[PDB]
């Protein structure tokens, strides 16, 4: 239950340098592998840098924050370079970078082929991340994945507001449970069904000995809209009521 | 009213592999065309891969749940090569994959330029989506595109909430209609005006002969904040109001 | 306090043409630079288009709403060629386009390395956005960035909703400062601690010699839930009380 960034094309990314195209970034996800004929070059198993020197680095970024759980770091498939140890900085708001566990020179990978993972306890919160090779075998080649916890079901919700009034006198007079409907239709129909939330914001309403009783409820929900039913009983006599409503659309 | 995904530079792309850069997904977009100068290769009119099986494919992701409404397959613009069939696969949590229609081989392209398009009844949502090339003539190469729909006028608003009461014995005395007005200073100033919407969470009030009388409501919103009015009438003695406000901010 | 789009990973980008992989819009950001080696190409100091006519283009986007302050750009670097003049286009909809200032035609670079840098007044608010060479000095080349305002704290929140009540007679009876707690559990677990938003839906009490006391309150909000405390004072006999809640989660 951690979603592999690389895999799923859900991050950009961006080189400092390339040796050249047949060697980028899109040469440089966990496991890349292409073809094994010697005869003709398909690119590298691995990004790798044109410049040799501390200052080259990968980003990877989008809008969304992300909560960083994992980094692997692989060497290059199809020839001996691998980086040796690399730092790390991200950015939260893709203006201000910091620096991984102050700067700390993590330890990479010594073959082309086997698997170094570090865990991030705490995640890392972050819109962009960078690996920024120190040392390397032969060249600053890598391949490698960045792991993020799954969005939640609550996150990015839509939401469409209104309000709501008995408008008369329906409920104004009367014995026992008695009740009016107001269909409420929503300015834009949902893709889906939401919640509807409500909140009172006037009561006109008379007490029946002393004693007050009123409700209202959203019920009959769709995608277009919804019925709020206004309720009293006892004896009651309620003038007017207003409630503000809150639509909330998840997972769309 | 559908999104051209690709066009509009919305998803990142990444195939299995590439014959080289010059055959890469950036040449993928359906129609895609470069110099007709045959004495320099300036890369396919298509993404080619290197290795020739049934395993080869393209995801196409982004962090954003899209409804993806159609796709079309072309072969390349520029040499004798299309794929004549593919499935489909794609992931709405970017953990647990999908096969589109239990697996439905998609009969597709016979020719260099023919659109084939196939439309999805309902939408498939997802955050990304894998084309998987099944057969081909002569090699695995196609232009393409992802239609969706465009996103909604009330999805990802910005919100900011807090509360408000009169705070004094403003309403606690007197005769008709009678309002009191407490400006709110959001925390932080919005880019455009928001909605306001409000609900009662105290009432401290003396009835009228019985009737309950009492009203709020938000006004004059700005950026940077609102008014809560505040608003009893006939001869209620109001002693305290407090509400909750939930400030929404759309399409910025 | 703005920031660089591409120098952060934050859009995907998409040209017209490539005069190959090592011209392409990975090699486009302001002031990039590779090895300065004569006797290797590792690729242009620009993107380079193939095809030099008034069509060409690249095309920057992502799914979030942006809003772009200024644009630089830049000739290339290590070959004498650059724009001269170019339009710009957007999109808020990814649907309908539309012409920057009326389809101005600006005027850009002179040189290879002196970067024209426009500012946008108010700010274009934008999914996607194109430049267009209009002019150039030996051929379509370019470097360049583009600059938005930072995401807004309040922005992208997650949301939980539900109702509580008290359920009993607890508050039915008594006198002076009487209240009880509901303790209410997320249907999912937050990553960080929301804040807790309530509005009343159902009053059932008997005033006071006239005077109607309640009060409701979210307290003690964790990851996992919060209390909502449900409060009477003087001699009021609350028989039952109905908050909907609103939890809303910022930043994460
Ligand atoms: C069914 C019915 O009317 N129930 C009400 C109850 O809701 C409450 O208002 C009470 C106050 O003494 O009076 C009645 O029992
Ligand atoms: C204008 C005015 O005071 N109107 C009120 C009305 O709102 C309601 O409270 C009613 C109850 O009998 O008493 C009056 O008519
Ligand atoms: C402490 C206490 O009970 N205060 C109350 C106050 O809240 C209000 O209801 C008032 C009405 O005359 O009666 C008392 O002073
Ligand atoms: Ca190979
Ligand atoms: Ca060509
Ligand atoms: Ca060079
Ligand atoms: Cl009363
Ligand atoms: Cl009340």
New interface residues.
Partial sequence: ????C??????????S??????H???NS?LNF???KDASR???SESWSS??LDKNQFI???????K?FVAISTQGRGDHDQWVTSYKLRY?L???NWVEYNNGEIINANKDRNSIVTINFNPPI?A??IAIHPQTYNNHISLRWELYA?????????????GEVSIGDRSLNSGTGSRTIVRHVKFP?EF?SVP?V???????????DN????????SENITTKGFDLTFITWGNNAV?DL?????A?????
């Fill in positions: 239950g951690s979603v592999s690389l895999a799923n094309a859900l991050l950009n990314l961006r080189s340098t390339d040796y050249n195209a047949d980028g970034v899109k996800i592998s292409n073809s070059f398909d690119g044109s410049v980003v990877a970024g989008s809008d969304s924050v909560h950015t708001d893709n203006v919160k819109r962009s916890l799954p969005v939640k079901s609550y996150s990015n919700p839509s939401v469409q507001v834009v893709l919640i939330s409500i909140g009172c914001k006037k009561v006109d309403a008379h007490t002393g004693q007050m009783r009123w409700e209202g409820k003038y207003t409630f503000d409503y809150v909330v659309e998840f997972n769309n």
